[PDB]
Amino acid sequence: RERTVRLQYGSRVEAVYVLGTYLWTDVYSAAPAGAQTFSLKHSEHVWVEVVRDGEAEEVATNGKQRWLLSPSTTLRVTMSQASTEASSDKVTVNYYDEEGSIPIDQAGLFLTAIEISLDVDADRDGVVEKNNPKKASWTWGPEGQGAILLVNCDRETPWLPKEDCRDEKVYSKEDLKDMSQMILRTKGPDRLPAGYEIVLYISMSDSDKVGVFYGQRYIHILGRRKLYHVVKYTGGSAELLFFVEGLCFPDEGFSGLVSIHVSLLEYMAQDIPLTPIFTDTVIFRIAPWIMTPNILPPVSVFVCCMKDNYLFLKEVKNLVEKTNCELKVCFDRWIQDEIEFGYIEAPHKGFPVVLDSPELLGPDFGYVTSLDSFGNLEVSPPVTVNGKTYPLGRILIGSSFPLSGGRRMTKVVRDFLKAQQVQAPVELYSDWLTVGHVDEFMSFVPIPGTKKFLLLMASTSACYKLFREKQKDGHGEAIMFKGLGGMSSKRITINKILSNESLVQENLYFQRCLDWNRDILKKELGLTEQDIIDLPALFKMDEDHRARAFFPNMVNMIVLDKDLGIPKPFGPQVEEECCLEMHVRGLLEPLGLECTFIDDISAYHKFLGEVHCGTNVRRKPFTFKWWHMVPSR
Amino acid sequence: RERTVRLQYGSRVEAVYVLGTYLWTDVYSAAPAGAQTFSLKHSEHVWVEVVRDGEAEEVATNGKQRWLLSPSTTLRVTMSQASTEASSDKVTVNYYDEEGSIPIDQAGLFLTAIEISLDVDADRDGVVEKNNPKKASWTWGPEGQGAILLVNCDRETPWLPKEDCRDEKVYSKEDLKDMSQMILRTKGPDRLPAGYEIVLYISMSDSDKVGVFYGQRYIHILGRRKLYHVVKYTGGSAELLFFVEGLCFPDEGFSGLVSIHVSLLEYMAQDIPLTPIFTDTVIFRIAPWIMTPNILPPVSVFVCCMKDNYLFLKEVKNLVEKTNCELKVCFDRWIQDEIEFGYIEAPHKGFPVVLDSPELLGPDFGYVTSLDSFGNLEVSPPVTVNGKTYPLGRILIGSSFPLSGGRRMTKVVRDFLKAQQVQAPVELYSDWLTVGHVDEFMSFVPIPGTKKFLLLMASTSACYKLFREKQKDGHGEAIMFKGLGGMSSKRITINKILSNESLVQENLYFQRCLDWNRDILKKELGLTEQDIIDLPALFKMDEDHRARAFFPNMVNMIVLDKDLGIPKPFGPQVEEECCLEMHVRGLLEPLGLECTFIDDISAYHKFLGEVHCGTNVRRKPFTFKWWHMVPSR
Ligand SMILES: CNC(=O)[C@H]1CCCN1Cc1ccc2nc(-c3cccc(Oc4ccc(Cl)cc4)c3)n([C@@H](CC(=O)Nc3cc(NS(C)(=O)=O)ccc3C)c3ccccc3Br)c2c1
Ligand SMILES: CNC(=O)[C@H]1CCCN1Cc1ccc2nc(-c3cccc(Oc4ccc(Cl)cc4)c3)n([C@@H](CC(=O)Nc3cc(NS(C)(=O)=O)ccc3C)c3ccccc3Br)c2c1
Numbered sequence A, B: 001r002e003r004t005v006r007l008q009y010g011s012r013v014e015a016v017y018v019l020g021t022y023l024w025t026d027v028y029s030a031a032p033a034g035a036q037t038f039s040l041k042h043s044e045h046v047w048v049e050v051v052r053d054g055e056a057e058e059v060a061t062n063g064k065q066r067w068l069l070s071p072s073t074t075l076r077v078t079m080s081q082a083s084t085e086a087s088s089d090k091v092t093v094n095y096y097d098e099e100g101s102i103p104i105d106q107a108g109l110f111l112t113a114i115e116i117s118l119d120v121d122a123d124r125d126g127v128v129e130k131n132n133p134k135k136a137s138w139t140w141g142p143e144g145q146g147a148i149l150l151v152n153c154d155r156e157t158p159w160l161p162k163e164d165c166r167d168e169k170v171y172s173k174e175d176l177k178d179m180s181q182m183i184l185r186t187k188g189p190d191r192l193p194a195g196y197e198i199v200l201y202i203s204m205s206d207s208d209k210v211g212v213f214y215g216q217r218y219i220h221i222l223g224r225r226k227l228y229h230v231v232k233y234t235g236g237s238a239e240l241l242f243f244v245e246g247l248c249f250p251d252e253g254f255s256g257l258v259s260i261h262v263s264l265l266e267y268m269a270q271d272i273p274l275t276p277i278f279t280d281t282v283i284f285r286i287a288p289w290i291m292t293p294n295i296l297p298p299v300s301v302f303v304c305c306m307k308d309n310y311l312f313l314k315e316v317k318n319l320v321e322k323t324n325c326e327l328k329v330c331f332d333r334w335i336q337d338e339i340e341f342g343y344i345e346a347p348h349k350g351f352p353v354v355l356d357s358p359e360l361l362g363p364d365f366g367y368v369t370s371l372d373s374f375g376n377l378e379v380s381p382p383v384t385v386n387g388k389t390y391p392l393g394r395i396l397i398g399s400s401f402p403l404s405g406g407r408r409m410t411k412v413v414r415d416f417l418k419a420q421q422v423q424a425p426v427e428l429y430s431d432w433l434t435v436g437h438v439d440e441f442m443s444f445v446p447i448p449g450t451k452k453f454l455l456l457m458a459s460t461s462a463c464y465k466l467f468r469e470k471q472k473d474g475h476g477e478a479i480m481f482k483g484l485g486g487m488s489s490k491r492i493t494i495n496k497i498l499s500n501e502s503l504v505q506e507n508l509y510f511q512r513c514l515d516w517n518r519d520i521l522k523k524e525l526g527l528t529e530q531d532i533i534d535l536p537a538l539f540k541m542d543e544d545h546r547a548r549a550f551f552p553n554m555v556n557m558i559v560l561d562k563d564l565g566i567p568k569p570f571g572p573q574v575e576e577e578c579c580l581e582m583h584v585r586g587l588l589e590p591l592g593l594e595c596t597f598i599d600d601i602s603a604y605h606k607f608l609g610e611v612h613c614g615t616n617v618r619r620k621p622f623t624f625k626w627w628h629m630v631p632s633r
């Protein structure tokens, strides 16, 4: 950075010189009228060149060479080390008239060199390097650089009703581990020369996105209602350590990028602005919320149910015991239908984070008309789609209107997840279902011993085929819902189901809804028919023309690596086994998937299309780092 | 695009097949219970493959081969030509039980193939090609593709008080030349089969950004308050021609990209949504506003002044006569200080466009608390800055606060121009000046016979040097403002100017303001001191501590290739010439620039820091096409 510093007619000019800049210096303007030539002297730590018409010549400390005064003959002044208390950094210019060789006048430039650098961890290795050249930009990918900030959305103090970033306070030293370090490194004399100060500042727009903290306590200096802070200079070689927290995830109208600036200001006069003679900038990107697909290793299984749902608890406990997961119980289905589990990550730092569509908030566990909802989401395993790799998978958003226009719509979740960028979301149509959730009709499971995964789809046509076979085999009087005494009076048999013509038509329409979704999934996830297994399902149309489950949706399962917790369907009994259970085992068991049917409904004596329990699984994060992605521009 | 179309248990399914898709067809679900094998027949224009476990075999029209019924044995159905009135496109599946070789049941798929394509000029050559593969995206650069839309901001009808895009009407055929063509191309039978319709739609967000128009008149079908339109199918090979207009320039919160969609819908039942069985999308980018630098050829010079400013008119007329420009006169300085001239361009189409900070609006001439203003702008010639090329130059925005934070600020012009992208704007500090305009302290001029350009900067230090020389030479009693009788009583001489110590200090501060700007210009435009010429200027500090011109700012000139219209400074007369005029000629004339001093102030008898005339120049556009740029992401 070349900076203009002119000498002043017959006078001395004092200036601070910031390392990594250099000066071009007018000597012509300060020359007395009549002067024809100049000479110069300079101290040892100042490099001076005479520059005529772009041609530079280095000049000695203590010569007596003279040059013609000309508008286009200037000086270039460079320093590489900071001034100390013992420094006499100066350039002095003598001016001569035609006749004599004694100087008629002198003009001086007295310099104090300082180093000033606002440093962040732009190379993403967890330590704050010195003046990364790329610290003022943010680039994606393995060769990308740019510092990363977490949203401080967990809670260090159960005293507080809110998450940590909701205030302008830091109570615990532990909190600083969620924050990113930013260091203002300076080198120079004991004091700044008279008339200078150093300020740190942010934009008003960024003031609800960041907080900056500096006895030995925690002072809030920038953020909500604080855009400008005067810094106290320490002389010699000094480091001022700041902690930065993110307050806000990327969203519609917020890219995730925030900036912090330092400037060295020069006082001119009262009533006149200070002159910003040097500025340095750092950029942070706020880490996105990332959802965890079913192929990632399970750590904890969270379950909600009523206290006397004993079979459910027993069978879930049992399922989880076949794994190394822990079970957490809360005493209908909010843990699944209100809430999604994901995580955030920065270099050597990260924690699980819950998104709520209006608890678990503590240390290292954070919290956060629409046609979509945070409780109506699924996420694929990593996929490659027509050459493009999606290493964190893609999110599926269940929507009442997954099209691009034709009506007024608010899609708050689509907007939020699109802003996260890294799981490039895809909308699906879920509002043909009474309950309205994508997890009632699709799931993903690993193929054990691979590598690969399957999409599981609910299928009415698979159910009809199965029931028609059983009827043909002589089992038409097989009874459904055995052991649900509240259903017994309906005496629902295969024959009764298959005779109901209206039900056939309803389920043909629902199969159209499933297949429309299937086609989007195959295109947007890069799947073939070889990647899909259809599980038998059956619905009844409600008065709003939506699909109510006729029996429990088996696709809405708990996936714990090779172990599957599948809702018990209470299907027609053939040879004293559920034909639906036997059918599903026949589909999944050959792949090495282990099926456990979990009875969530017996405690209620009947099934009316709703289940009254929920589950969610906290999983280990991807090993792939989000910042190594290159998202679409 | 693979699409799911299942056969229906023992029944016939009728479907529309859209060219560029293909079907995968379940035959297993439609099989009667007990059936073990199937065969198939198909018509000549349908390709059918049997696919087992991902392995496809092409099947004859009229064989008798049988395959085991299996969930994982399906059909793949492909067509490449549209159906006509004579077409019998069908696949029929026969099912057999173990024993007999007579079919026990049949299921049929009856197909109508159509072509449907929403086409735009994505290859940017001005003709609408057939189904450009890239039409649903927009990419920058010489190898970029994506259709371009102009803001229809000119006026075809002087009857109308507003510009054309301000309504949902098109009055003149001439208007359609400002619009982009979009063609819905179809091929198929006389009618769509029963239960289908074609719709065009946009988002609510895009409804104030676009209008779409289809007797032989102009019907508004999409745009403000119109998000959805049912299209009337014409059979055979048909083209439906639409005209699209842009309503809005890119801005804060609008990228410039808009989408239009077509879908083929299938009717299912009353009270149930239609199924979108096919969708096609096109993208437009709205062309940015581009400002014209002083190196571009002048076409028209617009001047405002009072009717009796005869010398001004005479001297401007004279200046323009040395060129081939036309002169347009309007009877203080709104043509310069309220208004900026630029242009918009699409393939084989474009016109000049004026931006107003609250007339010329007619055919092929369009119209459009803040710390910035559209009347406070300059633009560089094309520059290369640290390797990055800026082929349309960069805009300089004069600001009262050109820093990135520390206070609440609205910067409407910065936001708007940033959104245009292609002239990557740079903020300068202009509010140290009473009038507050960047054109009072900087200009750009071509070096004739090149190639190259110079930055011209106002300089107080150049003025002081000149006056001190003249005083030394014995001309201290030289009088300023000769011929301005309203100034005569002040008897302002060089000696009087140079004796005023307060004035020296004021102008030293103003030189600091100039140099701060100089340093930004050099860094952001890639300039050295070799590219800059300093013109003498002098200010007096007003009561708000701002700089009022002491004599006319010569830098604020009319640039007509090699001819410069420079404000007459009314400087001290030495040997009966203005020493300021002689000095400026000495700087510029050696470069082949021709200087004409234009007296704008004599008619007022005095100078108090304001000039009461304005000029603006409409120039030819860059030959470089904006869409060949690659802007920073
Ligand atoms: C006024 N408020 C405050 O200073 C702080 C304190 C509480 C919170 N405030 C934030 C606050 C609020 C409003 C501000 N406006 C400016 C400003 C104005 C014009 C230009 C300008 O940039 C340039 C100036 C020169 C050149 Cl060549 C190019 C650019 C900045 N600043 C300045 C600071 C400042 O000059 N203060 C000030 C002090 C005295 N008085 S004095 C000289 O005696 O100190 C009298 C007048 C003023 C305006 C600023 C901001 C961010 C980063 C660097 C700066 Br240099 C504001 C700061
Ligand atoms: C209702 N308003 C209107 O149609 C038009 C007319 C004036 C302006 N309106 C715009 C308007 C307003 C609201 C709309 N809501 C939808 C909609 C709803 C649910 C899903 C859905 O997408 C899918 C449906 C199925 C699958 Cl698998 C996957 C996705 C779309 N659409 C549909 C059209 C539609 O289905 N209309 C309709 C007609 C009857 N009645 S009927 C069947 O007798 O025609 C009864 C109910 C409805 C909802 C739409 C929009 C854009 C592009 C394609 C479509 Br397919 C609306 C259109």
Ligand SMILES: [Ca+2]
Pocket (backbone or CB within 6 Å): A120, A121, A122, A123, A124, A125, A126, A127, A128, A129
């Ligand atoms: Ca580091």
Ligand SMILES: [Ca+2]
Pocket (backbone or CB within 6 Å): A163, A164, A165, A166, A167, A168, A169, A170, A171
């Ligand atoms: Ca906090």
Ligand SMILES: [Ca+2]
Pocket (backbone or CB within 6 Å): A152, A153, A154, A155, A156, A164, A175, A178
């Ligand atoms: Ca915390």
Ligand SMILES: [Ca+2]
Pocket (backbone or CB within 6 Å): A154, A155, A156, A174, A175, A177, A178, A363, A364
């Ligand atoms: Ca923490």
Ligand SMILES: [Ca+2]
Pocket (backbone or CB within 6 Å): B120, B121, B122, B123, B124, B125, B126, B127, B128, B129
């Ligand atoms: Ca074309």
Ligand SMILES: [Ca+2]
Pocket (backbone or CB within 6 Å): B163, B164, B165, B166, B167, B168, B169, B170, B171
């Ligand atoms: Ca119009």
Ligand SMILES: [Ca+2]
Pocket (backbone or CB within 6 Å): B152, B153, B154, B155, B156, B164, B175, B178
């Ligand atoms: Ca028009």
Ligand SMILES: [Ca+2]
Pocket (backbone or CB within 6 Å): B154, B155, B156, B174, B175, B177, B178, B363, B364
């Ligand atoms: Ca026009």
